[PDB]
Amino acid sequence: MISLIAALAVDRVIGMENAMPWNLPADLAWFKRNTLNKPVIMGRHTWESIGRPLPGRKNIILSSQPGTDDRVTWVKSVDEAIAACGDVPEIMVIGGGRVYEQFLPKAQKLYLTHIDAEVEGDTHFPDYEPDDWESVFSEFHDADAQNSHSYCFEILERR
């Protein structure tokens, strides 16, 4: 099973200048809980944005060019990325925009954080078709002293 996990600001913005400009510790904690002990697939730009391997997860990087770091696994196509995960129950695709576009048709589950923040960005989450997806979990949180925007955790499963 393939799942996508992402945090979206208003208008599906996910990034600006290879960064995420907000800071929501509660959402990063949600990301860690839902990805720990699973393989994570990311594109090369997102690998450079994170800047280090994510501990406790098999890190798989998509790039058309040879890898430059043997602490992670480098693959050259979507099919190779999936195969490199082996026989696991759940593969987590962690972006970015181009990678989400390619894996969306193959995904059965979406873990989405909707952030009440207006961000100028240059990268968006794919338009998906709402009729294809059922919301099975949602949890709203107001802003607090640690998290400066309100946010909604949602899990959707392909109907």
Ligand X SMILES: NC(=O)c1ccc[n+]([C@@H]2O[C@H](COP(=O)([O-])OP(=O)(O)OC[C@H]3O[C@@H](n4cnc5c(N)ncnc54)[C@H](OP(=O)(O)O)[C@@H]3O)[C@@H](O)[C@H]2O)c1
Ligand Y SMILES: Nc1nc(=O)c2nc(CNc3ccc(C(=O)N[C@@H](CCC(=O)O)C(=O)O)cc3)cnc2[nH]1
Binding region for ligand X (CB under 6 A)? 6-7, 14-15, 18-20, 42-46, 49, 62-65, 76-78, 94-99, 102, 123
Amino acid present at 63: S
Which of the stretches 4-12, 64-72, 124-132, 140-148 binds ligand Y when contact is defined by CB under 6 A?
Answer: 4-12
Instruction: Tell me the C-alpha to C-alpha distance, in Å, between residue 61 and each of 21, 64, 74.
Output: 23, 10, 5
Helix runs in the chain, H state only: 25-35, 44-50, 78-84, 97-103
Q: Which is nearer to ligand X, 4 or 133 (CB)?
A: 4
Among 3, 99, 84, which Cα is nearest to 42's?
Answer: 99
Any contact of residue 1 with ligand Y (CB under 6 A)?
no
Residues numbered 71 to 90 that lie near Mn ion (CB under 5 A) are 77, 87
Annotation-wise, does 27 bind a ligand? yes
Among 95, 110, 123, 156, binds ligand Y (CB under 6 A): 95
What, of ligand X, Mn ion, ligand Y, none, does residue 128 touch, CB below 5 to 8 Å by kind? Answer: none
Size of the site for ligand Y (CB under 6 A): 16
Between vectors from CA 154 to CA 96 and to CA 61, what angle results, nearest 5°?
25
Residue whose C-beta lies closest to ligand Y:
28
Residue 34 structure tokens:
């839902």
Q: How far apart are the first and last CA of the chain?
A: 14
Any contact of residue 27 with ligand Y (CB under 6 A)?
yes
Cβ–Cβ under 8 Å, residues 138 and 152:
yes
Report d(CA 104, CA 117) in Å as an integer: 24
What residues make contact with Mn ion under the rule CB under 5 A?
77, 87, 116-117, 149
Binding site as annotated, residues for substrate: 5, 27, 52, 57, 113
What residues make contact with ligand Y under the rule CB under 6 A?
5-7, 25, 27-32, 46, 50, 54, 94-95, 113
